[PDB]
Amino acid sequence: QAGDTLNDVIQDPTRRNKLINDNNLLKGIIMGRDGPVPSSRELIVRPDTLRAIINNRATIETTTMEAEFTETLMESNYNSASVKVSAPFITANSEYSESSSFKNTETEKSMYTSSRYLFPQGRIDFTTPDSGFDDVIKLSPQFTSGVQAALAKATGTEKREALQNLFQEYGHVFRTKVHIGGVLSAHTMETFSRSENETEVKQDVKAGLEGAVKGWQGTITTSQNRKLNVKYIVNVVQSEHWRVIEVTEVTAVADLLPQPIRGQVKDLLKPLLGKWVDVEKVPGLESLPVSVYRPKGAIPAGWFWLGDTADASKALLVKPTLPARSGRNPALTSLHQGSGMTEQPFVDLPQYQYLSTYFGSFAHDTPPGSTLRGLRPDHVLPGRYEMHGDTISTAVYVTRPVDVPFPEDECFDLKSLVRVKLPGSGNPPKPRSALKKSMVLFDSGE
Amino acid sequence: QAGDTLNDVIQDPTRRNKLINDNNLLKGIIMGRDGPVPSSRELIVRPDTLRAIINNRATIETTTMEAEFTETLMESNYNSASVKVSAPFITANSEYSESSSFKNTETEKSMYTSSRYLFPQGRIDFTTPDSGFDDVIKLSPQFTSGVQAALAKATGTEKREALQNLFQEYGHVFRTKVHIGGVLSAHTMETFSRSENETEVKQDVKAGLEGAVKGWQGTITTSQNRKLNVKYIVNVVQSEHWRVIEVTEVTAVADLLPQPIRGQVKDLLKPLLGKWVDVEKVPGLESLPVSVYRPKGAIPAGWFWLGDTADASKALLVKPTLPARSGRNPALTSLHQGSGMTEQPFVDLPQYQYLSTYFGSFAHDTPPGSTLRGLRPDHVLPGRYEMHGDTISTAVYVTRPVDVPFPEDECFDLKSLVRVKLPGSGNPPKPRSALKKSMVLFDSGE
Amino acid sequence: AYAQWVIIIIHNVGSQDVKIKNLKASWGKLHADGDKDAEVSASNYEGKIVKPDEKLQINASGRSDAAEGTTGTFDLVDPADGDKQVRHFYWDSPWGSKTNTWTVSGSNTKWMIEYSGQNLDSGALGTITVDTLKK
Amino acid sequence: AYAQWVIIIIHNVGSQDVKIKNLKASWGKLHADGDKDAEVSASNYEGKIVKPDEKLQINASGRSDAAEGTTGTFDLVDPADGDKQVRHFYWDSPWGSKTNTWTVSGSNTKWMIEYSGQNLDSGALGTITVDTLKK
Amino acid sequence: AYAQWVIIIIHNVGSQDVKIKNLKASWGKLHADGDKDAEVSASNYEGKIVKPDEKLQINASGRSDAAEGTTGTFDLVDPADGDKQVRHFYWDSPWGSKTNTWTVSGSNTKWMIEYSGQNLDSGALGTITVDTLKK
Amino acid sequence: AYAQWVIIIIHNVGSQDVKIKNLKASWGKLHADGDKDAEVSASNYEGKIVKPDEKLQINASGRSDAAEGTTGTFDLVDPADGDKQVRHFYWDSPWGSKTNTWTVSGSNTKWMIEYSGQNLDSGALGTITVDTLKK
Ligand SMILES: CCCCCCCC/C=C/CCCCCCCC(=O)N[C@@H](COP(=O)(O)OCC[N+](C)(C)C)[C@H](O)/C=C/CCCCCCCCCCCCC
Ligand SMILES: CCCCCCCC/C=C\CCCCCCCC(=O)N[C@@H](COP(=O)(O)OCC[N+](C)(C)C)[C@H](O)/C=C/CCCCCCCCCCCCC
Ligand SMILES: CCCCCCCC/C=C\CCCCCCCC(=O)N[C@@H](COP(=O)(O)OCC[N+](C)(C)C)[C@H](O)/C=C/CCCCCCCCCCCCC
Ligand SMILES: CCCCCCCC/C=C\CCCCCCCC(=O)N[C@@H](COP(=O)(O)OCC[N+](C)(C)C)[C@H](O)/C=C/CCCCCCCCCCCCC
Ligand SMILES: CCCCCCCC/C=C\CCCCCCCC(=O)N[C@@H](COP(=O)(O)OCC[N+](C)(C)C)[C@H](O)/C=C/CCCCCCCCCCCCC
Ligand SMILES: CCCCCCCC/C=C\CCCCCCCC(=O)N[C@@H](COP(=O)(O)OCC[N+](C)(C)C)[C@H](O)/C=C/CCCCCCCCCCCCC
Ligand SMILES: CCCCCCCC/C=C\CCCCCCCC(=O)N[C@@H](COP(=O)(O)OCC[N+](C)(C)C)[C@H](O)/C=C/CCCCCCCCCCCCC
Ligand SMILES: CCCCCCCC/C=C\CCCCCCCC(=O)N[C@@H](COP(=O)(O)OCC[N+](C)(C)C)[C@H](O)/C=C/CCCCCCCCCCCCC
Ligand SMILES: CCCCCCCC/C=C\CCCCCCCC(=O)N[C@@H](COP(=O)(O)OCC[N+](C)(C)C)[C@H](O)/C=C/CCCCCCCCCCCCC
Ligand SMILES: CCCCCCCC/C=C\CCCCCCCC(=O)N[C@@H](COP(=O)(O)OCC[N+](C)(C)C)[C@H](O)/C=C/CCCCCCCCCCCCC
Ligand SMILES: CCCCCCCC/C=C\CCCCCCCC(=O)N[C@@H](COP(=O)(O)OCC[N+](C)(C)C)[C@H](O)/C=C/CCCCCCCCCCCCC
Ligand SMILES: CC(C)CCC[C@@H](C)[C@H]1CC[C@H]2[C@@H]3CC=C4C[C@@H](O)CC[C@]4(C)[C@H]3CC[C@]12C
Ligand SMILES: CC(C)CCC[C@@H](C)[C@H]1CC[C@H]2[C@@H]3CC=C4C[C@@H](O)CC[C@]4(C)[C@H]3CC[C@]12C
């Protein structure tokens, strides 16, 4: 039993099954409030064999991430692609607080760094249906039956509630590539001004953290006299003790379903229903360089509008799809009048955002301010300003979407209007956001 | 044995049963005066198996809580959701007293911090009936028979007494997700002015407590020179010595019952019976910017009102549901005349609160003073002030509920009146509380 | 002289009426608010009822370019029990001495009277605020 | 001269702290309650927090026999808003000029300050009660 | 003297109109923006309305060569409720004194007023910006 | 002389920071807000960063009875772009001359700077508000 590699474990049914069970390889991850914890219900049928490769090179690997709610994902040793795939679920299910140490203002930047001292034994691969090979992983009949039952409900709201329960029980993503072995991880976060040389800061933090893990102290001082708080994780102790040390790929659970059902599940998971309506020019505001338009007529009951826009053609109305419940982050937030010396609104729930400044006096008790709503942080992506006007007291920004090549990150071109200089004092932070196109479901009979 | 995981324990019936028994996994948690102690009577039927996941990452975690009576819950390693679910019972059954080290004034804020050094082995999950899966937990026939006997009593008071005894015996919540392994815990509390940067204080306390547990001294000095008192708990010593180290989810025991019985049990547990009555304008007080209204006519025998209100339509009368008994916190408290240089009333019992200042001379021996009452600290939530009047000498506050998206936290909009500047000196602290909607039962034939 | 002055504010912090009686300035003159030239007779205040939660101001001062201070007295009286004395106040802000006098004599257990702001060392007698409350 | 004197009673009627700052007696001297001889230093009040419902008394007066009057300044600032200024107070009871002066300046809008009791015609400036509240 | 000058900038940061009434310069003159030689009558500012987000500038100064500062008053008034008074502004930059006065009096909670930029130490009263917000 | 004074209020209404540099009062003295006696050092502002939406006051005035005006320079520079010069400001309120002066120079095309409130005819230089915004 000396010099056993992953091949010996896999070839032996007892040892192979012990590896599968002890590592929860048949279970998905539930990106919940507590982080990426595996589900307790098996998602796939037990394979007859595992595909694996052997790698025994021990080193220190450092990784950096700049997404906001990916602290726990980094703590689990998710590479860049896995964190990218898992970010929507963590962001949607995360717990928000205005006292978050992470900062991503226009002038300050924040980043998580993680150093892993690895003792690898190999990598294990799972074949997803989209790959097109013959040894695909088959979903357990229980999960398929649950999906069928969820989609068979009478009302769209019931379908969505059933799907939400199913994905909270079975998990949101499935780990398709995993690294077996032992690891010692050290994680930290750093905030710095954008003016500083980013490469120098990254190198300094990496050197400090790698020295910390290599010499394995809650506080580490780098060569630049940066005090970093370091969180340590031990996953090392004989094949009986090998554990998953790194995740190289995760596939969304919804992506494992067949295409006709995958489309329906994806559509029903969209937080908001959208609609295009006509607009009317706001009276007054003749000083401003551009016209301001708002939804025309009464807002249909149950729907909401997002803000003032410079578009003279149409406006987007959105309606939540999931009823509000305790322990669940609403898709939209209501706004309240500011404390004093400002007519602008403030988001009721922390970390939320709204797209445009209010061109008037905001009063949540009466329309059209009653139906103005913010957005959950996972719904929006930073935009780019276009300034109109030639004076500080009259210039206004139009928030155009940032062009991207992949449709996955496309945003609505609502042309939200922001005011360059808000009179008074104590105004809310200026919005610089655009709404994701993937978060809105159109043309539904609902 | 070496290399055994939770899977090996669960596979063997003897080891699985030993794990279930030694951890009291079939028993509810009574949130009594002594804290969250498990019940001595089995609540659910013994399962034939357990759903479990394996996790062996040892690390130091930290949590913070702002609620007042959640010290013991924090000491038991309850996460935020579990503490939120369990807080009503603890508070209701807690032992109130002045000189409480906790401070939650409008100037200073107090919080609990806990650092757990965890050496986990996995997590065990139970299926609640609300989940809808096929492996739901089944309540023991004795508990169901007890509930049926309680609900079959002749009078509402007897039913409520029987339910109170039953829930004191069988517990108030059931742990649905529990982590197994070993844990070294260090807990402390800190009070600080609201002006101070909350994030910095939290970070300093976390660093100090994490250092204390990692180096494992009854007192700790942080970077900011804060002196902290730390309580240490040891739960670490072989699969025979594994114990519950963290509670990730709890479900109220009442929620486990079938819906037709669950509704009746939930309704019968409401402390107060409510009623709406006509109001009358208080004579005099023409100087005040707004009119003051009090319940019109004689209060019905056995009913009480909560204070003066600015609402000109109706007033809320309340009546206790459970008779006063030793060792049980009453729902309402009498008020007594102040010591000197004030006509305002003071709560007889330590930590109760009333909603409005008395506009007149309070005499507890004559009406309507004799029928004015305060509320148990679990009955109320902080409100918000709307200011009326132009001068300090005559300005008043109207207390409005803080709008929330979840109906569970809705509070009555009684428009309680609070005098901005109370003449004289040695007046009681100003109330800024609103009554919870969930604590009052309406339209009952009682 | 106008350098000798006193302001007496009666502030009813309770919920029962209190009356002012026998107001009399043996030396000096009662005058208007912020106006030492506008003399006012004691009849403007004698017999008045302060009423709860409002203040009544009595302004006294010495005769102008006089070498005379201001000395006076009045009784706070309870009308609810046949006009019984609450307290008897006496103030003296002399021109030819340093020690001002502010005496609150009498006894009535049903009333509580606090007062503050007086200065007895030297100069004027200050702005004395008197909080009255029936218990 | 002790004949020129002032008392300032800051009363935090509100529910949040208010801090004194930059207290400075340019003329005369501060002193303890009821004793003009017991001089005190401005540091005894500088930076003090007046907790809600608390009262803080500042007594100032001229010298023991000098021809000086008294004059001073201070500021009320909000500790919870980065020590943003609430108000700036100036007091002056001159020995030579008859007219006194009590000036309150500033523009903080989330605070309400009400001062009363000053005398401006002649003699000592008197006792001034300053009720402060934060909306 | 042209040395004594003041500029009042009424800035309506709210969404509702405000009005200027009873503008009267007791001393000095009202002049054009930056041209003290161009006199302007008070009629050009009496009754004017400052629509939301507008700025209105009132320039006052003393006579060219005269020991005469500039003093004046006006009222900010709410036209939405029958020209109810909002505030009463009084300014005084005197030639013969080193202290300048800028007082905002009146009270009504429906409006928030925030003024800044004044100078009360010496010289001209300076430029004063007054933000008004109907809230 | 104290009659010559100026108050420069830097107001960063944009997003990126703006830094002050080379602040220097060739004549006169700086001082604290509302107090011309409390002299302050240029180091209290040198290299200071005006965060977005924040305001920073710089007060200058001539020396007490000096016959000197107040003159000075400073520069606004962009920290995010290697401290490139945004603008260079020169202020001058002479004592022996009637015409003041306030000149802003620079050719940075990614910043908008707007100043207002200065008085140039006679007397003090007044209060000058500068609004800065990075495009
Ligand atoms: C032909 C014969 C001529 C000579 C005879 C002398 C005549 C003088 C009369 C006798 C009164 C003497 C009062 C002394 C009080 C001492 C206490 C005090 O006034 N001391 C300081 C500080 O007092 P402070 O207020 O700070 O309190 C702290 C002190 N304390 C004691 C209270 C603890 C305070 O500033 C100083 C005040 C100035 C008072 C001086 C007035 C005398 C003027 C001399 C004139 C000489 C002209 C001669 C021409 C021929
Ligand atoms: C040729 C013959 C000359 C000798 C005969 C004269 C003898 C004088 C005797 C006695 C007078 C004094 C009475 C007491 C004052 C009572 C009024 C008051 O004490 N006055 C205060 C302030 O009074 P007030 O402020 O209240 O006035 C109201 C305010 N208002 C603004 C409205 C007016 C003010 O400080 C007080 C100043 C008095 C200081 C006393 C100095 C004695 C004068 C010796 C003159 C000798 C001349 C000799 C030349 C040859
Ligand atoms: C070579 C010649 C040199 C000598 C010339 C000097 C002339 C004096 C100049 C002018 C002093 C100004 C006096 C005070 C004004 C009266 C105001 C007043 O104080 N009068 C009553 C107050 O009455 P009251 O206060 O109630 O109301 C008042 C009414 N008002 C409506 C205004 C309020 C109060 O009792 C009466 C006080 C007694 C009067 C004192 C007089 C002393 C003057 C002796 C001069 C002796 C010269 C002879 C030497 C040889
Ligand atoms: C060529 C002609 C000859 C002239 C001869 C000179 C005669 C002088 C005039 C006659 C005396 C006048 C006093 C009686 C005043 C009546 C008012 C009163 O009576 N004044 C009391 C009351 O004031 P009080 O403070 O006590 O009030 C508190 C009330 N209380 C009840 C409690 C006591 C107060 O004290 C005491 C005041 C004393 C001030 C007198 C100062 C004058 C000095 C003279 C200098 C001489 C120079 C000579 C030049 C030729
Ligand atoms: C021929 C020669 C003539 C020229 C002589 C030179 C003198 C010039 C005038 C005198 C100085 C000028 C006063 C300034 C200081 C007063 C400070 C003060 O205002 N003094 C108060 C008291 O102050 P205070 O109450 O605070 O002390 C109390 C402290 N204590 C603890 C004890 C209570 C007290 O009332 C006020 C008294 C009035 C003082 C004026 C007296 C005039 C004198 C006329 C007689 C002249 C001699 C005649 C010879 C023939
Ligand atoms: C052979 C003899 C030759 C010599 C005779 C005379 C020599 C005089 C010497 C000494 C100078 C005296 C100044 C001392 C300043 C004190 C500090 C101060 O400065 N005292 C201020 C307080 O001012 P104030 O109290 O009002 O307020 C404070 C300021 N504030 C800004 C806050 C308002 C206030 O003005 C000052 C008033 C004092 C005036 C008294 C005048 C009567 C006494 C001279 C009569 C002489 C007759 C002689 C006949 C033979
Ligand atoms: C025997 C012959 C005696 C003749 C008697 C003369 C005595 C003078 C007395 C009366 C004071 C006059 C106050 C009037 C204030 C004018 C307004 C103002 O305070 N003026 C300011 C600035 O005013 P401003 O800035 O507005 O002007 C600019 C306007 N412009 C549009 C043109 C720009 C300017 O600095 C201030 C100057 C200070 C005043 C100068 C005093 C001259 C002294 C001469 C002494 C001669 C002794 C001879 C002995 C042999
Ligand atoms: C052979 C010689 C013959 C010639 C001699 C004739 C003397 C002149 C007579 C009469 C002067 C009367 C002034 C007329 C203007 C009054 C307007 C006003 O009233 N001027 C106030 C305004 O000042 P302020 O700005 O503060 O008021 C506004 C603010 N307020 C709050 C108060 C409303 C301010 O005090 C006043 C200051 C006046 C300046 C001082 C001038 C000195 C006069 C001595 C000249 C000496 C020459 C020498 C020759 C040998
Ligand atoms: C035979 C030999 C005779 C030689 C004659 C020598 C005369 C030299 C000539 C004159 C130049 C000297 C003035 C320089 C002013 C510079 C300081 C300043 O301009 N001073 C202001 C600013 O004062 P500031 O307010 O700023 O001070 C701070 C205020 N604080 C309260 C805090 C102290 C203050 O206001 C007001 C100033 C106005 C002053 C008027 C002009 C002076 C009058 C000369 C009278 C001469 C008569 C001649 C008789 C023989
Ligand atoms: C025989 C008759 C003789 C008559 C005597 C005449 C004496 C003059 C009287 C009184 C002047 C009053 C000045 C007070 C200044 C205050 C401090 C100050 O002005 N100092 C500096 C700036 O200092 P800073 O700006 O920092 O402020 C200070 C900060 N502090 C905290 C302390 C307030 C500032 O330049 C100084 C300027 C100088 C101006 C005065 C020049 C006097 C010329 C006289 C020449 C007489 C020659 C003939 C003699 C026989
Ligand atoms: C027999 C005995 C006679 C004795 C006579 C001796 C007189 C003393 C000589 C001369 C002193 C000169 C002071 C030095 C400058 C002060 C510092 C400064 O520097 N003063 C500039 C500041 O000007 P500014 O404030 O505008 O600078 C800011 C802008 N800048 C860009 C220029 C920097 C400003 O110009 C200059 C103004 C000139 C001052 C006028 C007052 C002089 C009074 C003459 C009295 C004559 C009486 C004759 C009796 C017979
Ligand atoms: C030899 C004798 C006759 C010469 C007399 C010269 C007199 C008339 C001169 C000297 C100083 C001059 C003053 C100097 C300054 C000013 C300030 C100005 O704003 C108005 C004129 C005024 C007030 C002047 C008036 C005339 C004046 C007083
Ligand atoms: C006869 C000989 C000595 C000439 C006398 C000239 C006198 C009368 C002159 C010289 C300076 C002049 C003053 C100069 C400036 C002013 C300021 C003005 O606002 C009012 C007039 C006033 C106050 C003048 C009044 C007359 C005045 C005092």
From TrEMBL, chains A, B:
Check the record and name the Pfam families matching this protein.
Answer: MACPF_1, PlyB_C
Classification via PROSITE patterns: MACPF_2
**Span list, region Disordered:** 423-446
Q: Which InterPro entries match?
A: MACPF, MACPF_1_fungal, PlyB_C
Identify the residues that the record assigns to the MACPF domain, covering every copy. Answer: 1-280
Which domain of life does the UniProt lineage start with?
Answer: Eukaryota
Q: What is the protein name stated in its UniProt record?
A: Pleurotolysin B
Q: Which species?
A: Pleurotus ostreatus (Oyster mushroom)
This protein's gene is called plyB
